[PDB]
Amino acid sequence: SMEQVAMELRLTELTRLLRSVLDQLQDKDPARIFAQPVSLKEVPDYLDHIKHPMDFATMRKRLEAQGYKNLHEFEEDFDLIIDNCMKYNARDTVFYRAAVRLRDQGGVVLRQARREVDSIG
């Protein structure tokens, strides 16, 4: 139908906007701490600690499958990256500190994305 197409165009344009958001967020992680899944070869007990792992590569796969229906879902995944790290790692670690900086800096990017999504429908 024409409505299904129009809806698919909306999802495509959301995907385009989320792709730019994701690039902007990932620039706030220049050390690449959150680029890839925590290795279960190198942290074999990780899933005993963290029940829903997340990372930027995993978000990118979902994005490119148009797997985010709205900004809330995308933000949920970004928040998992930060929150998982802040639980697994202690406060006095480069990992925890990198998460805090990503959260603080990403907040700005996400504040305007919310406005752009409400604005452009």
Side-chain angles (χ1 to χ4, degrees), residues 5 15 34 46-47 58 66-67 77 79 89 93 96 100 103 106 112-113:
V5 167
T15 303
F34 308 103
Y46 188 66
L47 298 189
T58 301
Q66 304 188 346
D77 272 354
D79 282 345
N89 305 104
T93 63
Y96 185 112
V100 166
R103 190 196 59 192
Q112 205 48 48

Side-chain angles (χ1 to χ4, degrees), residues 20-32 56 60 78 102 105-106 109:
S20 166
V21 177
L22 181 65
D23 292 345
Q24 277 174 79
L25 292 174
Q26 191 149 25
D27 288 338
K28 308 315 181 153
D29 172 33
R32 293 193 76 82
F56 289 130
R60 201 171 290 284
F78 178 62
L102 182 57
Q105 294 197 274
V109 171

Side-chain angles (χ1 to χ4, degrees), residues 24-40 42-60 62-68 70-100:
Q24 277 174 79
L25 292 174
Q26 191 149 25
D27 288 338
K28 308 315 181 153
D29 172 33
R32 293 193 76 82
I33 290 165
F34 308 103
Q36 289 295 327
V38 170
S39 168
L40 306 173
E42 299 163 10
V43 190
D45 75 350
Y46 188 66
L47 298 189
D48 293 345
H49 293 271
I50 295 299
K51 298 295 166 190
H52 297 97
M54 194 44 56
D55 64 274
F56 289 130
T58 301
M59 293 188 61
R60 201 171 290 284
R62 180 166 168 195
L63 179 68
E64 291 310 333
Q66 304 188 346
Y68 294 111
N70 55 57
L71 184 59
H72 178 75
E73 290 185 347
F74 178 95
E75 291 172 299
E76 276 194 337
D77 272 354
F78 178 62
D79 282 345
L80 273 174
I81 295 177
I82 297 310
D83 291 339
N84 286 346
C85 182
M86 293 173 71
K87 294 167 193 70
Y88 189 81
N89 305 104
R91 219 155 33 249
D92 81 322
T93 63
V94 63
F95 305 104
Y96 185 112
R97 292 171 169 284
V100 166

